[model samples]
Target: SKDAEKLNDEIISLNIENSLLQDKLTALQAEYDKL
Candidate 1:
């Protein structure tokens, strides 16, 4: 049960990081389009 909990925590962290990166990417693309 502990191992499962640890894995789930990691998955959530990774998902959050992925979402942040995606937002950053969208912002960068928007800036590029302005060029």
Candidate 2:
């Protein structure tokens, strides 16, 4: 099951990247709203 586990880890990493991007957008929106 090592391959399966590795694939799942990759999916998790992608999700983390997506979340990080979402967080950056949220921060940018907050800054924009201040204007």
Candidate 3:
């Protein structure tokens, strides 16, 4: 029964990672041509 719970947590973690990656992409875009 514990397996399902673990998988659910994994999904949540993945979403967090996705959001963080998106933020980094935005920052790079700004830095790519900064003065």
Candidate 4:
């Protein structure tokens, strides 16, 4: 149970990080298109 909870927490963190990366990549893509 503890391990499952830990895994859930890690998944949440990774998703949060990936969401940020996606936002940054989207921004970069827009910049690239403008160039």
Candidate 5:
């Protein structure tokens, strides 16, 4: 049960990290569009 809990937590953390990365990429693309 502890392993499953840890895995679930890791998945949530990674999901948040990926969302932040996606936001950064979107902002970078928007800046590039101005050129």
Candidate 6:
């Protein structure tokens, strides 16, 4: 149970990080277009 929980936590953390990076990329691209 503990191992499964640890794996789930890692998956959730990665998903959140991926979402943040995706949002940052969109913002960067928008800024580049303005230049």
Q: Which segments of model 2 are wrong by more than 4 Å? A: none
Which residue pairs overlap in candidate 5's backbone? Answer: none
Among the numbered candidates, top TM-score falls to 1
Rank the candidate models, highest lDDT first.
1, 6, 5, 2, 4, 3
Give me the runs in candidate 5 sitting further than 4 Å from their true place: none
User: TM-scores across all candidates?
Assistant: 0.93, 0.75, 0.76, 0.81, 0.88, 0.91
Quote the positional error of residue 17 for candidate 4 in Å: 1.3
Per-residue alpha-carbon lDDT of candidate 6 for residues 1-35, written as tens digits (9 for 90 to 100): 99999999999999999999999999999999999
lDDT of 4 at 35: 94
- Model 5 lDDT per residue over 1-35, tens place: 99999999999999999999999999999999999
Which stretches in model 4 have alpha-carbon errors above 4 Å? none
Evaluated against the true structure, the overall lDDT of model 5 is 0.98
* Residue-wise C-alpha lDDT for candidate 1, range 1-35, written one tens digit per residue: 99999999999999999999999999999999999
Evaluate model 2: give its lDDT: 0.98
lDDT of each: 0.99, 0.98, 0.96, 0.98, 0.98, 0.99
**lDDT by residue for model 4 (1-35), tens:** 99999999999999999999999999999999999
For each candidate, how many residue pairs have backbone atoms clashing (under 3 Å)? 0, 0, 0, 0, 0, 0
Q: Which residue pairs in model 4 clash with each other?
A: none
Worst 10 contiguous positions by lDDT, candidate 5? 1-10
**Location of the lowest summed lDDT over 10 successive residues in candidate 3:** 26-35
* Per-model C-alpha RMSD: 0.5, 1.1, 1.4, 0.8, 0.6, 0.6
